[PDB]
Structures are given as C-alpha cells and as structure tokens.
C-alpha cells in the first residue's frame, strides 16, 4: 500500500526513499543504480523498494 517506514529486516529507514527512488528511475537510472544511489546496500533494504507496490496512489483516486 504505502512505502514501509523501516526495512523489515534491519530497521533502516526506507520511507523517505520512495519518492527519491521514483525520481531516479525517471532520470533513466536502472533499479540497481537507483538503489545504490540511495545508499541501500544490504539486499534486505533493496528488497523493500525494489518490490514495493504503491497502491495508495490508486486509493487516492477514489473520492473520500
């Protein structure tokens, strides 16, 4: 739904990296390069962003 605040495995903060991650992908970065640019070195944290699905964007389409 929304980017988890912490990595589930180690507790690193990843909830401030989704927008930056999306922007890097917009800048023609490969997913691996974008994750490296954000400092996510452990594959547990790379898992968080590489596999995230932002459904909250779909939910915002429905009127409150």
């Amino acid at each position: 739904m929304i980017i988890p605040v912490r990595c589930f495995t180690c507790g690193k903060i990843v909830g401030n990296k989704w927008e930056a991650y999306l922007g890097l992908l917009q800048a023609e970065y490969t997913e691996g390069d974008a994750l490296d640019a954000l400092g996510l070195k452990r594959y547990c944290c790379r898992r968080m962003l590489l596999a995230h699905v932002d459904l909250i964007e779909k939910l915002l389409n429905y009127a409150p």
Binding site: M1, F8, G11, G32, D36, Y43, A63
Partner: protein
Amino acid sequence: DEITPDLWQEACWIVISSYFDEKGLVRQQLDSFDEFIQMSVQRIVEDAPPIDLQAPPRYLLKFEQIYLSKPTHWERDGAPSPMMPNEARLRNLTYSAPLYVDITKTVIKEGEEQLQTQHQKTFIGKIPIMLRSTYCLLNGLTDRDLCELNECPLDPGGYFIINGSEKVLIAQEKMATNTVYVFAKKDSKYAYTGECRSCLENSSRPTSTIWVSMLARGGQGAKKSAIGQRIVATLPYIKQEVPIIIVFRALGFVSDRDILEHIIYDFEDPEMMEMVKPSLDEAFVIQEQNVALNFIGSRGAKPGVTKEKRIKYAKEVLQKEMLPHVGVSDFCETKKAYFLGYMVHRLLLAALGRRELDDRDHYGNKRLDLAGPLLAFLFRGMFKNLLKEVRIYAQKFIDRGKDFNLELAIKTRIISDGLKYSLATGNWGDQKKAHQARAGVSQVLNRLTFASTLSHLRRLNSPIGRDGKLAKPRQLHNTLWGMVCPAETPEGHAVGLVKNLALMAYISVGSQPSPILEFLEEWSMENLEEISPAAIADATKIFVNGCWVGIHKDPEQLMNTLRKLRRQMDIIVSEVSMIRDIREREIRIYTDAGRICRPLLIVEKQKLLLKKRHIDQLKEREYNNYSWQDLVASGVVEYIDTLEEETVMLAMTPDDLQEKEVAYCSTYTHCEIHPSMILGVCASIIPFPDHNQSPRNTYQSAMGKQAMGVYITNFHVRMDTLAHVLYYPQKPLVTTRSMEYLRFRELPAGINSIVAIASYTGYNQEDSVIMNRSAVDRGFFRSVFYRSYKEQESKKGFDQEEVFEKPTRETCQGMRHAIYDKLDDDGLIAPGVRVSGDDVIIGKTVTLPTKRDCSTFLRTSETGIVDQVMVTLNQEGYKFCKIRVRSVRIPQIGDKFASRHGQKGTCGIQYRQEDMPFTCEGITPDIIINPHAIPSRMTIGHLIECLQGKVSANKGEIGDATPFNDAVNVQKISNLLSDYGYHLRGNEVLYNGFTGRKITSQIFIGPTYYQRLKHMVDDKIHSRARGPIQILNRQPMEGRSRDGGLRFGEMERDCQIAHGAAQFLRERLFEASDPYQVHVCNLCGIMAIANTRTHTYECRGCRNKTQISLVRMPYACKLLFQELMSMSIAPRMMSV
C-alpha cells in the same frame, strides 16, 4: 521476415500480451452472458408460439422484439434511477435491467374485420446483469470513470449482484450432445451401448437421449448362443427396450435390404452382416410399418386404449421425441433412419473391434455450460410460464365476453423472481422442483485474494457428484492440456472434479451452423436425401453439430477449403471446429457453445506464419489499432478445440521443434505460443513450477487462494462480511511472465522475506516457522481483518415491528450479560469505538405480542474498532444498517504462512532481532524454515527462487521464474550471485544470536516470497466449559461461534475402550454431554410421570405409584427410547 530464436522469447510474450490486452481473463463469462442477452433472449421470445385465444372473437398475441434498459433502481417514491454496482452491494439490491417486449394484439370478431394493436415495450420482468458485460453500466467506461463510481478498474466483472451478494456461475461440465458415443459396460447385460444425447437447435425442450445397446453373450441357450448378440434400442418415453429392427420398420423401412442399407454401407463386408442377423430374426414377426408403430406404442408412456391411439402415439415419439436434433418434422424419417443406422453402424464397429470405444474423460466429448446457456435454459421455462399465465388470465376475460388488458395479463414476477432465485440460491431450475435442481451452479464470489477472485471466475465443475467416488473422472486426462490447469484442483472430496481454465483457454460461445451448411451445399457435397446408400461406403460422412448432413467424395480439398475460410474469417467463424477423421472417413464440424479451445500458432512447411512484421506491429499495439484480432484475421493464429487437437501435429516451440534436426516430425501443423499457458491463474504465480513435485504445485494453487493481500483496490468502499488486507503487500522479487496478466503486481498477496533454511532452536520442526519478532514489530505481514455486520429492522404482522434503539434492561424482555453502553441513541454504535467480545453493536428490539431483545453481539473472539456504520434502505425498503469492525492482526504464534511452493507452516515462535542468527552484514532472517521440509517434498523451486531472489535484490532486477525457460538455469543464477560477493550456492556464514559464535554449517539464506494465509490461530482457538445446550438433544451446541463443544465421536469412543478408561468414557459420553434423570416403572420398563413438587410418581398403564425407580441416563437415550415409542416399539428399561 522471420522470427529468429534469439528473439522468439520476446516475440511470443508480445503475442500473449496482445491476447490478454483484448480478451482479459473472464472473457468466457462475459461473452456467454452477452450472447444470452443479445441472441438467446430474443430467440426464446421469437420461438414462442403466438398465443391464440378462442372463446366468437379470436385473439392473437405475438411477442415481436426485446428491449433491455440500464440496470435501474426504483426509490420508494417511484422515481427510477440508474443502479450503480456499488449501490447494489451496499444496499443489498439486485443488479437487474428492466426487460421489455413488443407485443402485437390482433382480434378477429367474425365480422370480417381485423383490429391490430401493438403494445410497444411491455415490461415483462427484470434480468440480472453480469458486471462489465455489454449491458452493464460499467461497460465502455474508462478506468478513470470506474474510479469515480467507486469501482476497481482491475475488477474483472463476470459475476452477478443478487441481493448485494456477488454471485458467479460456475461452468457446468456435461457430455457433448448430438454425438454418438459407444461405451462398454462390464457388469451390465449389454456388451456395448451406443448413446446419443440429442437436443434441439438453440437448446429447446431439454435433451432427449437414445441408447442403442447390444445384448451380452452371458445368456446361455441353444437359440441364443447360435444367433449371437441382438441389438435393442431404448427410446425415450418407452418403458422397455425395443428391438432395433422394429424401430427401422416403424420409420418406414420394411425390407431387410433397405434397413441394412442404412446400417451397413458395404455389403461386401461379411463380418458386419453376420452381426445384424440376430437382430433381423428378433423382429421377423413385425413386417409392416403400422405393426411396428403399434408395437412401440404398446410400451408408450401411457397405455393406448385402442390401436389407432397406439400407432399415433408411437409416430409422435419417433417424430419428435427420438433423435430430435436430426429432425422434428414429419418428413425427417429418412434422416433419422440414416442417423439411427449410423448409431447401429457405430455399435457394430465397436463390437467388431474396428473402432475404439469412446472415452468419457475426453474433453472433445465434453461441453461447459456457462452463464449464457445456463441463463437461457431458465429463461425458456420462465417465458413459457409467462405465456401460460397470460393465456390463463386472458381466457377468463375472453370467456366472460369482455376484452382483456394485456398489461394486467403479464405477471412480471415470473421472470424477475425466477432469474433472481436461481442465482440467489444456486438451486438450478425451479424452487418447487428443487429435488431435481442442480446445486452449486451459483456461488458467492470469493474475495479472499485477487487471485482467488480470478480463479473463481474461471472455475469448472465436473458433472460427477462430489459425494460419489470414482477415480477416472478425477484423473488428469491427457486432453486437459492447454485447456485446464493441470495443477489447480481442490484437495479432498473434490480432487479432480473442480477445475480451472488454462490461462489462454477459451470457451466457444456458439454460432449458427446455417452459413456452414449453405456453403457445404454450394460445395460439392451430396445431400443425404438424394444419394443412394451404396455411395456412402467410398465417400466421407459430413457431420455438422452431430447431424449427418451429407457425404463428400473429396474430403482433403473440402478440409483445406474449410480451413482456409476459417483462417480468413470469411464464412466460418474462429470458434468453429473442423475435425477430419481420416481413418473413419468422417468430417465433423462443430459450432455450438461450451467447446473449450485455445489459440495456437499456425505452421506451414515447418515455418510459423507469424513473422517479424506481426511482432513489430504488435509492439506498437497502441496508436496503431493492431491487436490480437488482427493475428486471427491474418491467419497466423487460430483457435483449436480438444476434438480438433487430436488431428493436430503441434510443436512445443518453434526454436527447436521446427528447426532441422534428427528426423522426428517433418509435418507440423501448429505451435504453442508458450508452454507456460497450460497453467491457470493460481498455478501461474508459482515460480519455477517445473522444479517442484507436482502435488506441491497443486497445494500452492490452493494456498494462493487463501493468501492475504489487497483483494481489490476499492476495498474501503466495500462492506464485505469478511475481508483481509495486508499492510505492506510486495510484488515478488522472482516473478513469472504470466503474472503480468493476472495483475499480481497491482494487487500482490505476499511479502518478500529473508528466509533462512536452518535448524535453529527446534521451534520450526514439522512444518513450523520461526518469525523475526522485530520484523513483525515493523509491520512485517501485519494485516487488517474487516468484518461487516448487517442488521435490518422490518415490521411484519398486526402489531409486531423491529426498531433500532438502545434496549433498557427493564423495558425489554430479552437480555444478555453483554454491554449495551456503546450503542448510540439511534441503537447503532458509532465509528471509532473500541469493541470487544460480548459487546452490542446494533441495538434491535422487537415488540413483544414488552419487547424482546434481538441485538447483535460482536463475535466473542473479535476485538476491533468500529470502522464504518452505513445506514440505508435495503431492497425491501426497510431501514438497513451495515457496521464494519476493523481489527489489526499482528502475526502471532500459530498463524499460517506459506511460500509459493506448497510449503505451508504455522509460526512456532518469534525471536527478536538480537536472538535471531545474523550474517556478517547484520542481516537476520525474517523467517526460518526447517531444512527437513525440503527433502521429502522436493520443492526445489523454493530453493531456486531463494537463490534467484538473492540475485534480484542485489542486482536490482525482478527475477524471471517462468517455468519452461532454458535461458534460466541454477548454474546461471549461481554465477550471477558470485558477482555480488556471495557464495554461489546461496549459503552464508551465520552467527548464533544467543552466543555470537559462527554456526559450523553455512546456512542457505535469501529472499523468498511468502504469503500470510487467512487461517489465523485467534480465529480457531475455542474453549468450552459448561456452555449452552441444544433444544432437541440437550447436548452442547455446535460450532465455535455458538460456544459449542467438541465432538467426542465414535473413533474417540473406540479409542477410550482400548484404553480401558471406562469412567473417563462415561464422563465424556454421559456426564460432560447430557446427564439426565428419568423415572421408570418397575413392573413395566416405560418412563413414569414424576412430579417432584408433589413428590407423586405414577405409571399410567400399570395403575401403580409406589414402585418407581429413578434411572440416570443420557438425555439422548431418553430421546431415543421416546422416538422408538413413536414407532410402536416399547424399550422397557428393567432394573432387575
């Protein structure tokens, strides 16, 4: 130009993408319904005979044309308004469209004057509408428009909303009609039996079956043994078997030469001639058509008073009740003689061993009844009822001499309620005739997972009853390839009976054979009525929809022409099956609905007709107008049904099987688009499913249906009875190509988990799992449980009514130890209020004939927060409240978790991050599974996914786990992993979290997609200690929700007998269930009347009151003896 193998993998998935961009995944549901509304409903109305009234003036009624409006809802004030599907769900309305018909009323008054009036658009009822079908409001709405209507764009539709319940019609599997099938019964008195289930075109009055059987040789006799085996026919409406030669005589063929000319097409064959000789002798007595007709009539449904009635009745049965699909007219005797002779000819070939017996498990011999044919069957009965009551109503008025109002003659309840009831209950047919009504056709759509929702819309139901047991129908027949998923099937009584469509499988909707028949006549096909029987031997029989239309002397040219027309879509539509049985000299053409087909790439001269230009055009599928249907029009891909697959030489892949190699097959007709399409929706999410033991793939297909996630994007607006939503669903790091079309990325049902396969502390043994407590503290596999409670206040009766209010302990009679303080003044709890077990969320009071309490109590285990409180008017116009209670479910010990490989397991313990084992990088596993789960199960795909998941996470690319992909190997994955500074086999040095010491063995650890299953321990934990008892047996109630007791069954009782624990056995079966006391007369063992208040015990019957004994027995034993006494038995309990 030509697709090279280096580009085939991309090319084939561009083709598959265009197919799903066009067809979707519930196309069989929507297409079937569209045909029923567009064609079947109009045909059923057109086919109805005009209603003629005569009782003098003569009135005629003809129903001309059908109109259907948008699904409309009428407010209590009478104002119509379009009914949105979401409103129907919330207000428990039925999503139905008004149905109107044009009726012309012509009256003849015997004065040579005719008055004709047309009642345009006469309301005749409401048809439930399948969602996202052509007649649904959501049809043709852009994804943006759907969101404005609070509808999920990913929602596929294909279901009905009946009383707010989403209902899906399961495809009902049945044997194909109009086809001759010869089967051998080992035990029966018949050596062979050739049946044909003949049905009228457009599925008129239900199928009529005719059996042609050959008697077994078991009977011993000088006359019976000498002659051989005789053939008898089991016609409908006839009690007893009729000899076959008599039926031919009744048709108008008397001379033996004439009859044999219709059965044996080559008299030069002596073996077949000797087979029919015993049948000729049996009917030697009957030598006239009228005598034969009388003989059949003698066995008729009703006895014939006179011979003339018998002959007329026999002609009636043969004319229409026998082989109706061949013909139903009075000039069809010759056509039926040829077909009946073909049935006898087919039976002879089976007996002679020249033709193999037909297979019931073959899906060429099967049809799937979808919503359309299902709905059309109901509508024919309801429309006949509508006209039956229109005739009855008009008869009363015309009899009295007054004209009748046409509108008042029509009862709109007949179609509206008849359609609604069948979909509402699933009992298929009539409520009055529920005894013969097929059950389970309609089911509430499963919304546990988006994959579960998709699977339920593609489910297939076998004809065989679930209660009945038979391995053969439950087996995975060869013919299910590409049509039915070989892995998705339930475990238990339904193994092999409930099936799911393969991913690209399509079910033919049906079309008229008229264009094909006309072309055949234009082509050099000799009609069956014009040829001589001698010409049939050399020529090939032409069957269209099971009806023998004629013969052809050049089958090869005709098949090439037919194939060319279908590929060009000139006269033959794509879903038409053309089967040439070269050995049997038959060409079978099929056009009816229910045929399962799949798209296949056409191969000519060992070359795919699909070239690079087609792929390039598809690549620009948008802004180019080129789609999947252009591939079918271009003639490079065509649909193939199961029957036609037998005649197809098919290449698994072009890159290898078409290429020059060791000569195996140089004549390939078709090619798979991709072999992964043999899987269904649920099996298509298994990564590396070709590396697992097959039962594991079946288990995952079941588990995936129970995985939490986001079942639909608009789940917030919905108020479902149960709904599970995962906090943080992830798309799998290791995916399959097919997953792109299941929308699994858009609605994932799991999380990628760092999984270590290790024996850590013994808390993951025997399919148990160790979870990371710290990961769970961070939202790992956190889920929401939504439960909705609906309550309706209805006033019905002279002074009895129900209202929403807070029931005061003094004012209201009924009451419970729960808490009524949360309820607001209007009797409804408010959103945002914490509610626990034994809390009242709806305050409902029913006036006492002061007032009883019917208040809704929250589930005892449930402890959530009121999320939404919706109040509205239900379909009945009564005030209606739905309350959604939200409970957050943090993964506990005992919660089920599965990988995508059948490796399910409850959480055995949760360790904090410091207690968990860690790598040198500080990574701890989120989940630890026991190594002992892998060896016996052989879920190697689980290990590959973990290895590939590690590469995917490090590389930053979603891994591809499409099953039959040579581009992916374990060695290739291992080599990639080495490049990221990890052991190439996925092992890592882990340190004990308790001591910090390196573990001697290196642990296989990596990302694996797990899924939280619906089964949570807190929903299953149940304790009973002297609860309530049921009225009939006075024993503990049944069910966890009723605080029932656990059953101490016969097996548990047998076990305690072996233990010798007589007293504990007495506790369970007497003291802890239903301890009871009765007073028994000593003279007679009957229970005596006991009045403890007056201390007077009497036995009415013995006239004694001094010798009565108290007997301690279970209440169920008392009920048994009393029930036995109701049957005049006298169970006399004697204490001496």
